[PDB]
């Protein structure tokens with residue numbers, strides 16, 4: 001029935017992933033994010049148990065909709081003549097890593113260590129559920145200013161996790177791995193490590209390292225900011241040209257720089273002064 005259930009608010013954001021609004025659950029007054037998607041702009045649809053032709057983004061979300069707050073949760077969805085309305089939980093207050101970074105420029109390695117770690121745990125959850133985000137970046141990461149927790153959002157570019165090879169891609173280009181930029185071929189797991197490599201750099205440097213294909217294809221990494229001798233390692237390791245030479249989510253978390261990580265609360269209580 002909608003409407004009588006949710007009280008739509010202002011336009012949070014939009015873009016190629018759709019349009020999101022700041023609505024409230026009339027039921028218990030729970031802050032939620034309403035997302036809209038045109039059936040014409042849907043890259044690839046999915047399938048539900050009860051045999052219902054619904055968007056893939058919905059299929060992916062439901063597969064990761066758990067108590068784990070590492071990823072955005074899908075409260076409920078609806079179908080319309082030429083579009084779908086996804087109801088997602090909405091943190092309050094909250095700010096995406098993109099604006100956060102633009103606001104406070106580069107981030108202290110300590111703070112990064114915390115975020116990046118939470119991200120890994122999140123991504124691991126997705127893969128652990130046969131789900132590949134395929135579009136990991138600062139814009140798709142929210143920050144629960146209070147609990148200092150992070151969440152992954154927008155799965156419109158993701159797809160079912162498979163050990164084979166992906167020939168298609170609809171995520172952000174600057175974050176895409178070199179193997180794709182050239183041969184338009186890549187493997188989820190290995191590719192994910194590359195995007196994370198870019199992200200990690202984006203945090204410690206305040207911006208992405210590569211801007212053009214030529215830069216990506218090459219793979220040479222330069223640090224404009226002061227980064228620990230070890231952090232640079234982990235970063236370059238992920239950004240390894242040859243996928244096979246890239247670190248695994250395990251090796252990444254076992255990396256020296258990924259030690260003595262702060263807790264969600266401590267982090268917010270120190271860097272988010274709450």
Ligand SMILES: Nc1ncc(/C=C/C(=O)O)cn1
Pocket residue numbers: 012017020033035072088089090091094142153154155
């Ligand atoms: N505040 C907030 N909360 C949730 C979202 C979800 C976006 C998305 O699922 O694409 C976006 N913004």
